[PDB]
């Protein structure tokens, strides 16, 4: 019925405490805000 | 010497708000983290 509610932080996955890595994340565009937007999805229609 | 090395940044932050045409208060909710800054 419901799966392990993960959240993972492609922010700091990705980039962990570098600011030219962050840049270099951010230059490929929103990608780390997909990945986040799509993990919050599977939380909610998990608790739905 | 043995010496254990732990990542920070534990846990993330969560806001908690009611409509905006309701209130500007706010509550803020940090993950599976003990109150310690605060």
Redesign the interface.
Known sequence: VSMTKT?V?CT?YIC??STECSNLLLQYGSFCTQLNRALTGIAVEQDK | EILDIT???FG?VSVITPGTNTSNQVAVLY?DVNCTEV
């Open positions: 959240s932080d700091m962990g405490d | 990542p920070c940044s993330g993950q």
